[PDB]
């Protein structure tokens, strides 16, 4: 592939299901939006 | 589909989820297009005779 956008950022574990193409939530509304031809993957750690 | 309506089915499911069942009425409507065109042209050709 051409380049890759890495985005630092933390959510809580209620919206890590609302990360994928189509959702809706607090996050997933007014923050940050996936569209349907958004192609690429999710890598998620605990920092607890 | 469980709906028969194009604005149904936009009005009810996610769009990952609403293109399946859209592109299953589509797909349907041209079987039924390909049923009308394909008795017209024989019977244009029973008419030509």
């Known amino acids: 592939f051409t380049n890759v956008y890495a985005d630092s950022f933390v959510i809580r574990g209620d919206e890590v299901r609302q990360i994928a193409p189509g959702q809706t939530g607090n996050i997933a509304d007014y923050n940050y939006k996936l569209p349907d031809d958004f192609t690429g993957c999710v890598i998620a750690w605990n920092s607890n | ?49």
């Open chain 2, 1 to 49: 589909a469980i709906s028969s309506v194009l604005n149904d089915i936009f009005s009810r499911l996610d769009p990952p989820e609403a293109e399946v069942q859209i592109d299953r009425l589509i797909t349907g409507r041209l079987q039924s297009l390909q049923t009308y065109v394909t008795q017209q042209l024989i019977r244009a050709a029973e008419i030509r005779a």
